[PDB]
Design a protein around this ligand. Structure first.
Ligand SMILES: Cc1cc2nc3c(=O)[nH]c(=O)nc-3n(C[C@H](O)[C@H](O)[C@H](O)COP(=O)(O)O)c2cc1C
Ligand code: SF4
Ligand code: SF4
Ligand code: SF4
Ligand code: SF4
Ligand code: SF4
Ligand code: FES
Ligand code: FES
Lengths: 456, 121, 209, 112, 80, 114, 216, 78
C-alpha cells in the first residue's frame, strides 16, 4: 500500500511534457473523442452516479466533491425553468506556486473541450464559457484553435456528435484580477460588471450567471472528466485513501534542485515526493526550513512535521493546513520566512477586490505590520496582537480571500515565533528601543512626513 | 494603567465591561410569592409531571389561589424552612458587613478619665 | 403564507422569503448595520449585522440571509459581540480624526454604534498610518469630503436605482477604491440633495448648511 | 471583577428577609423589590400607618430613624406621585424603603 | 406647546442673544402611552391636537432580487 | 480665572467651532455662531462668554480638542458695568494674545496631567 | 497604485475622437455575438481590450466610445476598466517589463533580475524610459511559478532567467530584433526537469481505447 | 472608598449636651490627621480614573492619536 510512483499506463494525461503534440489527430492517437457519441447518448443520471463513485474531490482548492456539486444542479423541477443553463470553466489561475492549469491548456486543450461537453451533458447545460486569464495570451490562442478544430470535426456545436444535443463553448478572457478566481466573482465578471464576489445564500446552482443557473468548475477537474468516464470509477477510486481518491498534478517549485510539474498519486509522502522526482532539496533534507503545500493560501509546515505527512486533504487538515492546489513551495534555510510572508501579505493587499470592510481594511493592516516585523520595529507582544488581527479577519468576509489572507500569518506565528523574536532582539540592540506602532523616542512629526524613525 | 486593561491584545472589552452587565430589579408581586410557596423553587422543586406542572402553574399565574390560602395550605416544614429561620425565629434585619465594637479604655484613649467623651474603635 | 421562527427566545412570524434583519426588526431586536436601508437594495458590504444562527458554521450577514422555517437566531452570543467589536475596529483604522470638524457630530451612525458595540481603545498607531483620499468636487449643492468614507455603496445604490443618475460609482481595488464620478463630472438629478441624508458618515454633506 | 459580585450573598439574605416581611403582613404589602442590597416594600396609601409602626416596633426590624422621605412624579401613571420613605435601623445596621402612591389631590396619611 | 407669534424669540439689540418671552418653549414631556398623554392633557385642562405616527410599509426583500433574468430589455444596470 | 482664546504659532485663531465648549458648559455661558469663511476653513463668526453666569468649572477648557480656549490665572479684572463683563470674540482674542507667554508656563506643567 | 481619478489636461479628453478600425469593427461585431442579445453589456471586457490593441493604452475616448456602442452609461465602463490591472490608462512605451516578484520568483532570484534590469536603464518600477521604449512594472504571479524566475514583455513570457542573460535580452530589445519567441535560453522544453525526462519515456502514447469500462 | 483598609477610632459622647458634641469634634481632627498620615504612607501607584472610556474621557495624549478615543471624547461631552 506504498502510495506513490504510479505506472505510465495509469497517468491521465500524456501530453504533460509535449512529446506528442497538441494536434486533434494526435488527440485521436491519445484516445480522445473515441466514444463520446455513446457517452452523450447515456443519461445524465448515469454520468452523475458514475462520478459519485469515483470520489472526485474538487481540484480548485476548496475540495468539494464534484458528483455532489454536479447533482445540486438538478432539482426535480429544473425542466419547468424552460431556458438556457450555462457551465463555467475556471481556467484562471494566478495562485502563487501553481502552473498546472497552464499545463492543462497548452499541452492538452482537447480533453478540456471534451470534458466541457461531457460535464454539460451531465447537468443538461446549453452552453459553456471558459474563463482564461487575460495574461495567458498564447494559451487562449491555442485553446481557440483547438475549439475551432472541434467545431470543424462536428464534435461540438449545434448537433454535438450526432446526438441531437446542442452545445457551444465560448472563450472569455479576464484582464488581470485574481479575486475573479472565486466562483461568484467569476460569474459577475462574465456578466460584464466589476468582478466582485457576492454573498452565499443565493447559490449559483440555484440562480447564477446572467440570472440563469450556473456552476463553476476548475479546468483540471473538467479535463479529468472524460477519461474517468472511460476508464471507470472503480479504477480511479483505487488510488489514494478511502475518501481522498485518485491522482493529481503537483507543481513543485520554490527552492528545490529541479523545479517541475508531475502528475502523481494522492496520499503520498512529501519526502518521497520531493526526493524521487525533483532532484532533491538544494542542500539536502538538512536544508529544509519549511514547505507550503498548495498555493499562497496555506500555512507553512515546519521541518519535523513534514517528514511523515501525506499529500491528501485529511493528513493536511489534521495538521491544521490545506492541500489547496498542491503547489509545493519549499523555503530554503538560507532564505528568510519573514520576507516571504511579507511578500504574501503584499500579494493579498494588491489582489483584494475591496468590497467588504474586514478584508479590505485588514490586509492593509497586515502589510503595515509585516513590514514592521521584517525590519523588527516592535514589542514582544505585537505578534500575539498580529495573531488576534488574523483571527478577526478570518471568518467575517464575503469570499474566502479574507480567509486566505489570514492563514499564512497564522502559520508563521504558530511555527516561527523565535525566528521573529531573533530579528526583534537584533533591531533592539542595533539601534534604540521602540514603542507600540514602531514609534521611537526620537520620532516626531515634522512638516509633512515623519522623521526620527526609519519608516518601514 | 493596570495590566489586564491596558493590554493590547488579550482582552476584548465585552469580557471586562460591567456597565452593560448591570443586574435588574427583582420585582416580586404577591402572586409570584404564592408561586414560590406552592410550586416551589429552582433549588428545591416540589413539582412532578412537568407537562401538567405548567397547567398547575397557570392557575396561580391567573390568580387561582390566594396568598393567605397559600400560607394556610403550606406545611409546617415549609413555613419553618423558607419563610422563617430553621429554628422557628424571624429573620434578623440583614447587614452587609457586621461591625463589632471594642471600647478603648486606658492610656491609648483620646481623652483621659474624667472627660465625658469616650473612644470606641 | 408566513413563517414562524425564534429570535432571542421571542417567537416571531414574518412573510416568507424576507431578510433576517426584517425579522429582527419585527421582533424588536436591535441589530446594528451600515449598508442596509429600507428603500434601497441589499448589499453585504459593511459586515456589521453578523448574527449567530443555529445550523451555520460562520456568523451570517443578517441583511441578506433569507428567512427559513424552524430558525433559531441568537444575537447575544459572545461570538457575535466579539464579531461586532472586530468589524468595528476594522472600520475605524482608516477613518480620520475629523469629529470636531465633521458635520455629523451628534448624528453619526458610525459614532453612536461605536460606543454601543465597538471597542474601548484603538490599536491603530503605525508610523505610516491612515490612507488619504483626494477631495472630489461634485456640485454646488453637495460638499464632499471623502477621507471619512466607509464605502457602504449606499449613495451609489441609490443614484443607480431610484434617482436614475448613473454617474456615481466605485472605481478601484483595495484601499484605492473611491466613490465618485471618475472624470470629475458634475452630478445632476432632481433630488441630489437626498444623498447627503443617506450617507451614514459625513462624507457627503450639505453645502449651504 | 464585577462590583455587583460582592453583594450577592447579602442580596440573597435580603430576599429571604423580605419574603418573611410579606408573609407577616399580607393585608398591607403589595410587593417588594430587591435591587442590590436595597430593599423596597410596596404598600398602599391607606396601608402606610400600619406598616411603619411594624417597622418601628417589631424587634427584628426596629427601623427607628427616619432618614429622608420624598416624592417622584410619573405623569404617565393615573396615580401621579409616588412617595418614598427611607428608614435606618441603627441597631441592626440596616436600611429599608417604603413606597406608596398618591394622586395630586387624594392624600397619603402622615407618619408624624 | 405651539409657539406664540409675538412671544417666541427675538434678537437682542446688545449682542445677538436669543431672548424669549414665551416660557413653555423649553418644557417638553415624555409619556409611555397615547392614552396617558390624552388623560393628563385634558386632566390639566389644555386644548390639544394629536398627531398620528407613521410607520414604514413592510416590503419583502431578497438579495437574489438583485440579478433576476431579464427576458426583454434590461432597462437597468446594477452595479454593487 | 478669566478666559482666553489662544492662537497657533504663526497666528491662526485655533477655534474650529466644534461647539464642544457650548455643549458641556453647566451654566450655559457660551454662545457661538459659526460660518464657513472665505478660505473654506471652519471658523467661528461669533464667540461669546457671559462672565456673570460663568461658574469657573473648567469644563470648557477640558473639552476643547484643539485646546483653543483656556483659563488664564488672572482674577484681577473686576469691572464697574455689566456690559464690560460680557466678553465677545474680540476681548477673548485680545486676552489670548496678552496672556500667551503666561499660558505657555501653565500648559508646560499641566498638559501631561490633563 | 491603482490610481483612479482622471486628469483632464491633454491627450485624454472626451473631445478627442476615436473609432474602430474596420477589421477591429468586424471583430467587435463578432465578439458581441458570443453573448445573449439581451446582455450586450457583458461584452464590455473584451472590446476595451480591442481598443487597447489599437491605441497604445485605454484612453477616455475608447471607454466613452465603447459605452456609446453598448447602450451603457460611461461610469459602468469606468468601474470595469478601473477594477482590472491590465487596462493601463497611462501611456507607455512599446515594451512593458512585467517582472514577477512573488515568493517563488523571490526564492530563486527575481531580485537579481529586477536589479539587472534597472541598472541597465535608470528608471523606477512605475517609470517609463525617456526614449518611450521600455516601461517597468513589477507584477505579481504570472502563472509560471515552476520556471522559477521569470518576466513578461508584451504577451510573451521569458523564463529561467539569469541576471547575465537578462541584460542581453534587454540589449536585444534595444536593437529592435526580437530575442526569442521561446520561454528561456533553451535549457528545457516547458516544465520538464532540467536534467531530463523522468516519466513519459515512450515513443507513442498508450491509447485509451484498450482500457475501457465495458459499461459504454 | 477604602476606609476599611485605614485604621482609626471614633469619639462618641455620653451626655447629649453641646459640650459632648464639642468634644467629639475636637477628636475627629485627631482621627482625621491619623487618616492623612496612614494614607500618605500607604499610597500605591496606578490609574486614577476608571478603566474605560465609555464613562469618562481619554487622556489628551491618547485622543489626539486614537480614532476610537476621539469618538468617545466627542460623545462623553455632547
Ligand atoms: C480568492 C479566491 C481565489 C480563487 N482562485 C481559484 C483559481 O485560480 N483556480 C481554481 O480552480 N479555483 C479557485 N478558487 C476556488 C473557486 O471558488 C473554485 O472554482 C470553487 O470553489 C471550486 O471549484 P472545483 O469544484 O472545481 O474545485 C478561488 C477561491 C477564492 C476564494
Ligand atoms: S474577502 Fe476581500 S477581496 Fe474578497 S470579497 Fe471580501 S473585501 Fe473583496
Ligand atoms: S462621520 Fe466619522 S469623522 Fe465625522 S463625526 Fe462621525 S465618526 Fe467622526
Ligand atoms: S460616499 Fe457616503 S454613502 Fe457613498 S459609500 Fe461613501 S460613505 Fe457611503
Ligand atoms: S473653543 Fe474649543 S470647544 Fe469651543 S468651539 Fe472652539 S474648538 Fe470647539
Ligand atoms: S469655565 Fe465652566 S461655566 Fe465657564 S465657560 Fe467654561 S465650562 Fe462654561
Ligand atoms: S448591513 Fe448587513 S452587512 Fe452591511
Ligand atoms: S511566482 Fe513569480 S510567476 Fe508565479
Amino acid at each position: 500500500r506504498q502510495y506513490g510512483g504510479l505506472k505510465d499506463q495509469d497517468r491521465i494525461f500524456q501530453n504533460l511534457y509535449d512529446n506528442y503534440g497538441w494536434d486533434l489527430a494526435s488527440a485521436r492517437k491519445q484516445g480522445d473523442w473515441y466514444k463520446t457519441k455513446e457517452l452523450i447518448l447515456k443519461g445524465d443520471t448515469w454520468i452523475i452516479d458514475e462520478i459519485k463513485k469515483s470520489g472526485l474531490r474538487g481540484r480548485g482548492g476548496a475540495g468539494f466533491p464534484s458528483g455532489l456539486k454536479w447533482s445540486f444542479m438538478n432539482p426535480p423541477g429544473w425542466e419547468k425553468n424552460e431556458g438556457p443553463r450555462y457551465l463555467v470553466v475556471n481556467a484562471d489561475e494566478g495562485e502563487p506556486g501553481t502552473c498546472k492549469d497552464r499545463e492543462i491548456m497548452r499541452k492538452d486543450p482537447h480533453k478540456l473541450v471534451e470534458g466541457c461537453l461531457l460535464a454539460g451533458r451531465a447537468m443538461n447545460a446549453t452552453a459553456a464559457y471558459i474563463y482564461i486569464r487575460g495574461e495567458f495570451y498564447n494559451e487562449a490562442a491555442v485553446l481557440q484553435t483547438a475549439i475551432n478544430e472541434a467545431y470543424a470535426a462536428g464534435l461540438i456545436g449545434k448537433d454535438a456528435c450526432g446526438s441531437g444535443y446542442d452545445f457551444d463553448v465560448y472563450i472569455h478572457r479576464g484582464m488581470g484580477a485574481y479575486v475573479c478566481g472565486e466562483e461568484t466573482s467569476l460569474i459577475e465578471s462574465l456578466e460584464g460588471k466589476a468582478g466582485k464576489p457576492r454573498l452565499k445564500p443565493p447559490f449559483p446552482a440555484g440562480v447564477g450567471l446572467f440570472g440563469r443557473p450556473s456552476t463553476v468548475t476548475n479546468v483540471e477537474t473538467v479535463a479529468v472528466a472524460p477519461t474517468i468516464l472511460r476508464r471507470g470509477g472503480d479504477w480511479f477510486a483505487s488510488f489514494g485513501r478511502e475518501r481522498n481518491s485518485g491522482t493529481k498534478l503537483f507543481c513543485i517549485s520554490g527552492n528545490v534542485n529541479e523545479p517541475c510539474t508531475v502528475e502523481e498519486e494522492m496520499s503520498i509522502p512529501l519526502r518521497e515526493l520531493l526526493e524521487k522526482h525533483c532532484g532533491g532539496i538544494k542542500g539536502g533534507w538538512d536544508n529544509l526550513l519549511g514547505v507550503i503545500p498548495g498555493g499562497c493560501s496555506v500555512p507553512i509546515l515546519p521541518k519535523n512535521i513534514c517528514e511523515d505527512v501525506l499529500m491528501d486533504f485529511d493528513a493536511l487538515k489534521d495538521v491544521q493546513s490545506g492541500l489547496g492546489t498542491a503547489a509545493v513551495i519549499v523555503i530554503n534555510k538560507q532564505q528568510d520566512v519573514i520576507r516571504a510572508i511579507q511578500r504574501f501579505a503584499a500579494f493579498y493587499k494588491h489582489e483584494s477586490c475591496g468590497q467588504c470592510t474586514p478584508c479590505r481594511e485588514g490586509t492593509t493592516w497586515l502589510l503595515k505590520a509585516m513590514d514592521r516585523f521584517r525590519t523588527g520595529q516592535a514589542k514582544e507582544r505585537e505578534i500575539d496582537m498580529l495573531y488576534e488581527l488574523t483571527k478577526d479577519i478570518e471568518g467575517h468576509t464575503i469570499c474566502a480571500l479574507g480567509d486566505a489572507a489570514a492563514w499564512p500569518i497564522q502559520g508563521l506565528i504558530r511555527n516561527f515565533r523565535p525566528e521573529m523574536e531573533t530579528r526583534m532582539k537584533k533591531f533592539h540592540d542595533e539601534v534604540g528601543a521602540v514603542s507600540v506602532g514602531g514609534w521611537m523616542k526620537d520620532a516626531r512629526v515634522e512638516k509633512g512626513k515623519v522623521v526620527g524613525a526609519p519608516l518601514p | 494603567s493596570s495590566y489586564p486593561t491596558n493590554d493590547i491584545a488579550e482582552n476584548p472589552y465585552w469580557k471586562r465591561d460591567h456597565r452593560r452587565a448591570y443586574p435588574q430589579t427583582a420585582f416580586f408581586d404577591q402572586k409570584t410569592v404564592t408561586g414560590l410557596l406552592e410550586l416551589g423553587s429552582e433549588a428545591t422543586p416540589r413539582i412532578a409531571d412537568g407537562e401538567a406542572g405548567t397547567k398547575a402553574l397557570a392557575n396561580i399565574a391567573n390568580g387561582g389561589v390566594s396568598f393567605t390560602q397559600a400560607l394556610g395550605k403550606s406545611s409546617k416544614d415549609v413555613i419553618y424552612g423558607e419563610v422563617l429561620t430553621v429554628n422557628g425565629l424571624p429573620p434578623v434585619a440583614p447587614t452587609l458587613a457586621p461591625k463589632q465594637w471594642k471600647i478603648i479604655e486606658g492610656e491609648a484613649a483620646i481623652y483621659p478619665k474624667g472627660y465625658p467623651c469616650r473612644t470606641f474603635h | 403564507a408566513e413563517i414562524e421562527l425564534t429570535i432571542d427566545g421571542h417567537k416571531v412570524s414574518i412573510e416568507a422569503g424576507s431578510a433576517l434583519i426584517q425579522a429582527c426588526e419585527k421582533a424588536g431586536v436591535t441589530v446594528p448595520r451600515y449598508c442596509y436601508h429600507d428603500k434601497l437594495a441589499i448589499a453585504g458590504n459593511c459586515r456589521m449585522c453578523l448574527v449567530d444562527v443555529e445550523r451555520a458554521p460562520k456568523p451570517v450577514a443578517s441583511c441578506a440571509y433569507p428567512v427559513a422555517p424552524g430558525m433559531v437566531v441568537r444575537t447575544d452570543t459572545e461570538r457575535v459581540k466579539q464579531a461586532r467589536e472586530n468589524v468595528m475596529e476594522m472600520m475605524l483604522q482608516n477613518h480620520p480624526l475629523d469629529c470636531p470638524v465633521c458635520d455629523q457630530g451628534g448624528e453619526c451612525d458610525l459614532q453612536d454604534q461605536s460606543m454601543r458595540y465597538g471597542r474601548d481603545r484603538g490599536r491603530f498607531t503605525e508610523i505610516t498610518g491612515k490612507r488619504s483620499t483626494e477631495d472630489k468636487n461634485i456640485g454646488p449643492l453637495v460638499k464632499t469630503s471623502m477621507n471619512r468614507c466607509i464605502h457602504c455603496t449606499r449613495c451609489v445604490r441609490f443614484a443607480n436605482d431610484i434617482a436614475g443618475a448613473p454617474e456615481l460609482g466605485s472605481s478601484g481595488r483595495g484601499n484605492d477604491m473611491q466613490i465618485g464620478t471618475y472624470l470629475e463630472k458634475n452630478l445632476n438629478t432632481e433630488l441630489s440633495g437626498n444623498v447627503i441624508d443617506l450617507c451614514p458618515v459625513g462624507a457627503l454633506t450639505n453645502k449651504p448648511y | 471583577v464585577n462590583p455587583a459580585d460582592r453583594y450577592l450573598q447579602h442580596v440573597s439574605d435580603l430576599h429571604q428577609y423580605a419574603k418573611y416581611i410579606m408573609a407577616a403582613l399580607p393585608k398591607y404589602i403589595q410587593g417588594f423589590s430587591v435591587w442590590k442590597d436595597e430593599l423596597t416594600l410596596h404598600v398602599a396609601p391607606s396601608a402606610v400607618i400600619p406598616v411603619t409602626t411594624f417597622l418601628r416596633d417589631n424587634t427584628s426590624t426596629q427601623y427607628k430613624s427616619i432618614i429622608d422621605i420624598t416624592a417622584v412624579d410619573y405623569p404617565s401613571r393615573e396615580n401621579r406621585f409616588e412617595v418614598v420613605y427611607n428608614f435606618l435601623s441603627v441597631r441592626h445596621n440596616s436600611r429599608i424603603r417604603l413606597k406608596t402612591y398618591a394622586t395630586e389631590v387624594t392624600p397619603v396619611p402622615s407618619i408624624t | 406647546w405651539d409657539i406664540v407669534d409675538v412671544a417666541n424669540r427675538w434678537e437682542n439689540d446688545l449682542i445677538g442673544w436669543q431672548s424669549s418671552g414665551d416660557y413653555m418653549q423649553a418644557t417638553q414631556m415624555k409619556f409611555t402611552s397615547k392614552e396617558s398623554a390624552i388623560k393628563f392633557a385634558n386632566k390639566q385642562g389644555w386644548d390639544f391636537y394629536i398627531q398620528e405616527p407613521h410607520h414604514r410599509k413592510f416590503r419583502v426583500k431578497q438579495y437574489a432580487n438583485n440579478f433576476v433574468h431579464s427576458y426583454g430589455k434590461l432597462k437597468h444596470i446594477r452595479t454593487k | 480665572g478669566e478666559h482666553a482664546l489662544r492662537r497657533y504659532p504663526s497666528g491662526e485663531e485655533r477655534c474650529i467651532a466644534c461647539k464642544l465648549c457650548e455643549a458641556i458648559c453647566p451654566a450655559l455661558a457660551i454662545t457661538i455662531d459659526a460660518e464657513e469663511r472665505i478660505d473654506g476653513s471652519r471658523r467661528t463668526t461669533k464667540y461669546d462668554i457671559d462672565m456673570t453666569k460663568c461658574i469657573y468649572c473648567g469644563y470648557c477648557q477640558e473639552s476643547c480638542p484643539v485646546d483653543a480656549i483656556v483659563e488664564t490665572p488672572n482674577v484681577e479684572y473686576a469691572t464697574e458695568t455689566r456690559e464690560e463683563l460680557l466678553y465677545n470674540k474680540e476681548k477673548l482674542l485680545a486676552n489670548g494674545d496678552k496672556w500667551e507667554l503666561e499660558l505657555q508656563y501653565a500648559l508646560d506643567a499641566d498638559a501631561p496631567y490633563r | 497604485h491603482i490610481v483612479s481619478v482622471h486628469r483632464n489636461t491633454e491627450n485624454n479628453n472626451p473631445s478627442i475622437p476615436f473609432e474602430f478600425s474596420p477589421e477591429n469593427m468586424k471583430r467587435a461585431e463578432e465578439v458581441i455575438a458570443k453573448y445573449p442579445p439581451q446582455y450586450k453589456k457583458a461584452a464590455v471586457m473584451p472590446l476595451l481590450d480591442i481598443g487597447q490593441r489599437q491605441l497604445g493604452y485605454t484612453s477616455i475616448s475608447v471607454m466613452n466610445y465603447v459605452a456609446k456602442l453598448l447602450e451603457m452609461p460611461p461610469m459602468r465602463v469606468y468601474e470595469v476598466a478601473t477594477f482590472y490591472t491590465m487596462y493601463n490608462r497611462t501611456p507607455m512605451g512599446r515594451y512593458h517589463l512585467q517582472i514577477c516578484t512573488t515568493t517563488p520568483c523571490q526564492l530563486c532570484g527575481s531580485d537579481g533580475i529586477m536589479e539587472a534590469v534597472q541598472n541597465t536603464l535608470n528608471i523606477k518600477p512605475g517609470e517609463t524610459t525617456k526614449d518611450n521604449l521600455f516601461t517597468l512594472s513589477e507584477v505579481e504571479c504570472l502563472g509560471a511559478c515552476v520556471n522559477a524566475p521569470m518576466m513578461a514583455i508584451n504577451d510573451d513570457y521569458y523564463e529561467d532567467l539569469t541576471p547575465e542573460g537578462t541584460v542581453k535580452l534587454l540589449e536585444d530589445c534595444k536593437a529592435g530584433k526580437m530575442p526569442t519567441p521561446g520561454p528561456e535560453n533553451h535549457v528545457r522544453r516547458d516544465c520538464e526537469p532540467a536534467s531530463g525526462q523522468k516519466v513519459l519515456l515512450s515513443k507513442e502514447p498508450h491509447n485509451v481505447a484498450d482500457f475501457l469500462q465495458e459499461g459504454i | 472608598d477604602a476606609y476599611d483598609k485605614v485604621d482609626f477610632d471614633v469619639p462618641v459622647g455620653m451626655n447629649g449636651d453641646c459640650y459632648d458634641r464639642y468634644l467629639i469634634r475636637m477628636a475627629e481632627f485627631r482621627q482625621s490627621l491619623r487618616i492623612i498620615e496612614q494614607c500618605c504612607n500607604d499610597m500605591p501607584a496606578g490609574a486614577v480614573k476608571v478603566e474605560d472610556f465609555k464613562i469618562n474621557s481619554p487622556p489628551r495624549n491618547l485622543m489626539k492619536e486614537d480614532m476610537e478615543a476621539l469618538i468617545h471624547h466627542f460623545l462623553l461631552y455632547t
